[PDB]
Design a protein around this ligand. Structure first.
Ligand SMILES: Nc1ccn([C@@H]2O[C@H](COP(=O)(O)OP(=O)(O)OP(=O)(O)O)[C@@H](O)[C@H]2O)c(=O)n1
Ligand SMILES: Nc1ccn([C@@H]2O[C@H](COP(=O)(O)OP(=O)(O)OP(=O)(O)O)[C@@H](O)[C@H]2O)c(=O)n1
Ligand SMILES: Nc1ccn([C@@H]2O[C@H](COP(=O)(O)OP(=O)(O)OP(=O)(O)O)[C@@H](O)[C@H]2O)c(=O)n1
Lengths: 534, 534, 534
């Protein structure tokens, strides 16, 4: 039980799919009974993605331990069963923060603190932390080799390879092998120049993963094998694919996992990818099609809703339904009205912060509730569902969240400390990561989850106001799930409706292609049943 | 006045179209009344392409002065009217041969001969020799920047830029800006890394020519401008095109020629590209279509017949005929028979050396003659036409070339020194470049060329045997052209045929898209007339 | 068994003593009973040093086979007993000449000839030719790593290391570790940057030879070991020394030969360096001192007479005489007179071509003969001795060489084809390498060499004119040695003189510190005897 490390780097361009490649390889190794994990080294200065805007860098992924991480850890958890934590993602900012803190504590004993060895040492320590207790650790190095931003990471993993040795370390380098119409051939020259940059900083690649818009032929792979001084079997073709679920099979068919198990002297049975083959089959053979509207305030970058989009796809797989995801700007509902929500088989309102576009989401929730269109609200999607029902059924004029209208008469959503009734009377911070939720008997979610308790992940400040809840309950709304000593509302259901569910937690973070998710499976099923009625 | 130099380099990949880009820019500058020339610096060790196989290198192009050169000089002569010579193309091989000859002789006076300064000095001397006496000299550096083979060339042109100054030198660097489906954007990172390699060898690019399979948008051009420290108008998009004739217009529309004229302080009128607009109009508006079979022994690389393929296209422009060029392996005629010559409106047998596939070409010549299918034979194409007629009409059994069957009874083709009749009685080396040919009255070619004398370019050793010619003439074959004191046969015609012409010279080398060529215009017209008769 | 290769490279500066280091290591390995050889790869374009001036390049060394080579092959033959040939030295010029000859001929079968693989293949072929049939082959790469001139050599030896493997190849890299008064320490940063340049071209050094003006301490060697990823015992201190004969001992004391034998799995006994210890003892314990004047025309670079200077030192070892070598410009004898030849215990006139300074050498030869000062003339030194005697004893007015005065009345020195007497009557090119010489009975050289025949090496065109010889013999000059069928004069002696010898051959090329040389031993002894008589 010596821990093995696969260092995953990228050359020529950034957008090679280093994360998907790492996750896909990890999936093959896990299917051989190996204990595998993945970690992402990000050369950005942000202490963590917590601050990074959804519009700029896509969704903030939440691990069970409540870490705010890169969306790549979503890819990792959708490919392997090993649970991600704070240890599986860190930035240059984190490393510099670590070292600056160690200096304050006096750990360096008045020594001059240097990129080598002190920054490189801090990097190695965090890689070992995240890696130890596993058979194989895949370490994705963000950036493009030759850029200055990743030089400390590359020096750190170079040192690790010398210490640990070539028996228990491999360098897997992704490269672009682009097609030129002029020559009717894919070109290895960019790979030649990228590998030279790698050699210049003291790294010899063991494995070349050749990215192209088509198969990289044996002739070109043999050319790369010779100039890199690696076996031809260590040069892998990874063409553009219509589904990332195919990549594990494509890598296995070229025997990449065999090469890795040989290099690390790992005796394990053949990879059983039957579950991945099933996912590919399901995706390729939908029985019917549905159009589901995702009404949010960050649609300008789809990666803002990465896990929600994948969760809707996984809902399709389990129902053998093709899901047409129509990304709708909630602000367009405010200006152009409810006419742009026509021709939808179901409506999803995802998570978000700030008031911009929220009134459009409240209108969207009302439209879905009144017209019996299947509805799933996530976090902000539950708030607007509660606000809708408060205003338009419970007759709480201008009911809102204190996040949006602090001095509103009916703050149906607010921080626990702000909880007040309509008369301003009172009783007597961000919730992050996994928490147990108690499901109410005879609720739809109790039926779908088939358990009295569930574990789902939070990323929110503002709660359902329990002081104004009973008046909304009396108006017909049903509490389907609660959590903690304060009995905070986790799930609500509108019962006089074919399928209307809204939750505080982020169910998209526990959805996988192989296992699906009870809420998303139920939601897409309801969408198909609605579509058949129309 | 002062001679200006544009050094044309390429990064990321070899196959950027550096020659086409240089030729297209030269076309714009010529259309502004400037005296422009182009030269090609090839990093190969071959003293010249004379030895290099067509299937390895593409066609050997022949200049008027009889130099054997890169096919790029064909691009140059098809875009500008400045005539190419030996001075417009040289290899590393030529430079080392020059320096070794100077050294072993004693020109260096017992000095140590070094890459710097002696190899770089030899390079600069040949660039000056080709350039001086022109307003603008475009110098294409073969290879990809970063490779070791072009480092001496790049050091040479770096020194020239220092000596001459930034007032009369520009660095124009072609780069690949490839599209990634993953990012949905073209990627500048390869340009970033390529420019870094240029800077490391002391070259700052003035102009970036951005190659891609689509337009490089203003936002990406703005990024390249900033990281290269060049004006935005010095960053040019050159997307993949269906027609190279459009490239002059594409570059002019982005003001590339304006920027160059400003940098070199050239006061000249706006480029009138009406001649190129006309070529584009002709090409886009064909009246009819033909299929012309090109039957040869080098079809595995189409660039083996680069100038012939372009000459057929030019023949189409002048007739408003779309030419579908079907490359047919002459060895397939030997094995599968004349079956594979079905559905052709005309047949062209191009040049070649060695006996492999020649019997297939003789069979092809016979097929075209007997079935009244328009035929054009070039060099070897004339040999197989003469052999066909000698064997199958003049009843000269197994008539051949001494190149193929040295001891044959009827050497109808042979070296002048080998000339013998069928009884072995006799009379009492490579022809290269332009030579006057005298056309015979009442010949098809005398009408087509509409002149008593023409100038065409040779690349051949083996002549028509004048000792056996009179017997072939008596059998009905006509001599249509002669040259020199030995009265060597240059053109033959089969009169009892709609269009049957074969020439010793290479007419494809004097064909241009603007001027066309009388022989190819006549050939494609005959192909159109045959197609209509069917 | 399997041939082992040690690739010897240099970084930071050129003048590291790569040749001396290679030769000194080879000496240790030979003293362990191994069959060892050395070869020099020069990045100069000169086909060979035959053209290169002595004042530019240093002496042209001549091997037994008559190859004109780098003076480093003199270092090699003075450290190991393995005889050098044409195979032990080649230039970039030779490689390009080889490849151009192969190309223009037709060995590459119409292929494109490229730096990689064709130039690198030609390099590897010549390394194999020189190396195969030896236990250990030391391959010295001329130039400084990072320079463009040696990139093909470094790529060639990189490929060899991959092909042969790390079991039978080592990279030994010389580096400068310079002392800074400011820091009071030697600096490893230049070694760091040099090794980075090696890594960028795909070479990992196995051994670091650290050059400095003092010992590189264990702490600095430990730093170099870590950043190069080599054992501490693979990092060697080679400080500046007063005697190159000490370097074998210095390297052995640090176990360099032990590390090499271990890496190559050579089981051989410990190096016995007693022969080198004896040379060091002799050198350190002289009994008397002499001043020997070397009067020539290339003294502006002492390396012009490298082997002659070493041969005089070896003459000192055998006699326990400390030799003070005073380099005197022969042109200063022409201007200032024989004043500048005062206080000399002996006079040596070495080889040379052209008339500049020759009259000064004739005056020098006369001075030594008339004043009974021991004289040794080598090649030109023999010519000026013959001319001196012809003019001033045999009364042949203005006697000269045809090289200097072609139409002179008494051409006592001339080409065999030019041989004429004073009346213009006649009888009815460069001699290179080892030739047998027959020594005459009762001659000084017959006693010194203690054999009737000797083998010495030539580099000359102009011979003693046998037509005018008998008259010079009658005047008292003695012929002491002859060669060949033409009975060419090899050695002359002035008998009425304590020690006056002059030879056509270059005896300095067969002198070694261990074996000495009979002629130089006799010369230095005569110098000592003259000094005592004063
Ligand atoms: N470090 C290197 C490696 C290769 N070459 C040169 O690269 C040329 C071949 O380049 P190219 O024609 O672009 O082909 P490939 O290297 O095969 O590249 P690609 O796969 O992109 O076609 C050869 O002449 C060789 O001398 C070089 O100069 N320096
Ligand atoms: N010499 C350089 C230049 C840039 N960067 C880094 O490159 C990153 C951006 O790279 P990428 O995301 O690939 O985008 P672009 O550079 O815009 O490249 P492309 O046009 O290919 O997307 C930045 O974080 C910057 O710190 C670097 O490390 N070293
Ligand atoms: N980028 C360069 C620059 C120079 N050279 C080579 O460097 C050699 C000269 O190096 P060297 O003898 O060390 O002399 P200098 O360069 O003058 O260095 P120094 O001042 O240290 O003596 C020349 O043959 C030249 O071809 C090279 O290969 N690449």
């Amino acid at each position: 039980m010596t821990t093995n490390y696969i260092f995953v780097t990228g050359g020529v361009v950034s957008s090679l799919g280093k994360g998907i490649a790492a996750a896909s390889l990890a999936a093959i190794l896990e299917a051989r009974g190996l204990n595998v994990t993945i970690m992402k080294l990000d050369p950005y200065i942000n202490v963590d993605p917590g601050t990074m805007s959804p519009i700029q860098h896509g969704e903030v992924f939440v691990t069970e331990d409540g870490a705010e991480t890169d969306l790549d850890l979503g890819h990792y958890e959708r490919f392997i069963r090993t649970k991600m934590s704070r240890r599986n993602n860190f930035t240059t900012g984190r490393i510099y923060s670590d070292v600056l803190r160690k200096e304050r504590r006096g750990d360096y004993l008045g020594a001059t603190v240097q990129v080598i060895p002190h920054i490189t040492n801090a990097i190695k320590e965090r890689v070992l932390e995240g890696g130890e207790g596993h058979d194989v650790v895949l370490v994705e190095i963000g950036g493009t080799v030759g850029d200055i931003e990743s030089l400390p990471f590359l020096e750190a993993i170079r040192q690790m390879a010398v210490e640990i040795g070539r028996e228990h370390t491999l360098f897997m380098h992704l490269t672009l092998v682009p097609y030129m119409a002029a020559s009717g051939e894919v070109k290895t020259k960019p790979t030649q120049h990228s590998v030279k940059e790698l050699l210049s900083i003291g790294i010899q690649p063991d494995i070349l993963i050749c990215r192209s818009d088509r198969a990289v032929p044996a002739n070109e792979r043999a050319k790369i094998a010779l100039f890199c001084n690696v076996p031809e079997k260590a040069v892998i073709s990874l063409k553009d694919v219509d589904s990332i679920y195919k990549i594990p099979g494509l890598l296995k068919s070229q025997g990449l996992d065999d090469y890795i198990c040989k290099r690390f002297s790992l005796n394990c049975p053949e990879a059983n990818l039957s579950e991945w083959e099933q996912v590919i089959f399901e995706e390729a053979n939908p029985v019917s099609e549905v159009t589901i509207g995702m009404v949010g305030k960050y649609i300008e970058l789809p990666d803002a809703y990465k896990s929600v989009i994948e969760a809707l796809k996984h809902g399709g797989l389990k129902n053998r339904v093709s899901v047409n995801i129509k990304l709708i700007d909630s602000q367009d509902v405010e200006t152009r009205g409810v006419e742009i929500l026509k021709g939808l088989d179901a409506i999803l309102v995802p998570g978000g912060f700030g008031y911009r576009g929220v009134e459009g989401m409240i209108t969207t929730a009302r439209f879905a509730r009144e017209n019996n269109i299947p509805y799933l609200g996530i976090c902000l999607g539950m708030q607007v569902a509660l606000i809708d029902y408060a205003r338009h059924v419970a007759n709480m004029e201008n009911a809102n969240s204190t996040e949006f209208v602090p001095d509103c008469k009916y703050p149906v959503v607010a921080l626990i400390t702000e909880w007040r009734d309509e008369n301003g009377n009172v009783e007597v911070t961000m919730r992050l990561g996994a928490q147990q939720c108690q499901l109410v008997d005879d609720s739809l979610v109790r039926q779908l989850y088939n358990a009295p308790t569930i574990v789902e992940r939070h990323r929110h400040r503002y709660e359902v106001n329990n002081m104004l809840l009973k008046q909304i309950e009396d108006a017909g709304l049903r509490v389907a799930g609660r959590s903690g000593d304060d009995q905070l509302v986790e799930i609500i259901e509108v019962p006089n409706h074919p399928w209307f569910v809204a939750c505080q937690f982020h169910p998209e973070f526990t959805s996988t292609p192989r296992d699906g998710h009870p809420l998303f499976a139920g939601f897409v099923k309801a969408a198909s049943e609605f579509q058949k009625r129309q």
